[PDB]
Amino acid sequence: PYVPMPCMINDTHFLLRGPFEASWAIKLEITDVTTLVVDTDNVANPTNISKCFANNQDERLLGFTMEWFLSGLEHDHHFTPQIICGNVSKGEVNAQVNITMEDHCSQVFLKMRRIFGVFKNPCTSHGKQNVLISVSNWTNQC
Ligand SMILES: *[C@@H]1O[C@H](CO)[C@@H](O[C@@H]2O[C@H](CO)[C@@H](O)[C@H](O)[C@H]2NC(C)=O)[C@H](O)[C@H]1NC(C)=O
Ligand SMILES: *[C@@H]1O[C@H](CO)[C@@H](O[C@@H]2O[C@H](CO)[C@@H](O)[C@H](O)[C@H]2NC(C)=O)[C@H](O)[C@H]1NC(C)=O
Ligand SMILES: [Sm+3]
Ligand SMILES: [Sm+3]
Ligand SMILES: [Sm+3]
């Protein structure tokens, strides 16, 4: 009752409400579109992941909600999908994670299945596919 609240809009779209009935939620979209590109300072990793969400001081529990979400997968050095931080100042998502690799994808699905419940396995999809991560308002969608 005081922990992050998972919400599954549909197979592609997921929300994770912040603790204590937070007005915000970490949004996750599974998509085959890439909106971000590698730069010197924009690339992060699951241990670096907390760094991508530096925009807002108002909602400080965002970084915790992420370490909670990674489920200790930053400690699995075989879990190494490409993560690219986004420049929110220029209207782009906080991070895109390339989950095209099959073992990363099955390892991401297994974590999201226990969290969000059963939904369609995106690893059956072919070719490029990403998880896009950004912040949104919570509107009691679930
Ligand atoms: C899951 O729900 C989202 C919205 O909650 C749908 O997003 C729409 O996606 C279509 C493209 O397929 C766009 O044309 C719409 O503008 C989007 N609407 C919104 C509100 O984002 C998404 O389509 C749904 N998933 C599926 C498979 O239909
Ligand atoms: C977290 O990411 C930063 C950049 O986003 C990494 O910084 C550089 O990473 C490259 C290769 O990843 C190294 O060759 C540089 O020496 C790093 N520079 C600095 C100042 O760190 C950073 O290493 C990552 N954190 C890690 C790997 O613990
Ligand atoms: Sm803010
Ligand atoms: Sm907060
Ligand atoms: Sm090893």
Of all protein residues, the one whose alpha carbon is nearest to atom 23 of ligand 1 is 12
Of 69, 72, 62, nearest in space to 136 by CA: 62
d(CA 1, CA 141): 17
| Distance between Cα 98 and ligand 1 center (Å) | 20
- Determine the structural domain holding residue 90 and report its residue range: 1-142
Residues whose CB is less than 8 angstroms from the CB of residue 135 and which lie 6 or more positions away in sequence, other chains included: 24, 25, 26, 27, 53, 55, 56, 59, 62, 94
Ligand nearest 136 Cα, by number? 3
d(CA 127, CA 23): 35
* Method by which this entry was solved: X-ray
Of 4, 86, 75, nearest in space to 52 by CA: 86
Give me the number of domains the chain comprises: 1
Phi, psi angles (nearest 5°) of residue 128? -70, 135
| H or E stretch at 84 | strand 82-85
Count how many Cα atoms sit within 13 Å of the Cα of residue 125 in the half-sphere of its side chain. Answer: 17
Q: What is the DSSP letter of 26?
A: E
Ligand nearest 49 Cα, by number? 2
Is residue 5 a contact partner of residue 24, using CB atoms and an 8 Å limit? Answer: no
d(CA 132, CA 85): 10
Of all protein residues, the one whose alpha carbon is nearest to atom 17 of ligand 1 is 13
Q: Which of 36, 38, 39, 45 has most ligand 2 atoms within 8 Å of CB, for mutation?
A: 45
Of all protein residues, the one whose alpha carbon is nearest to atom 6 of ligand 2 is 44
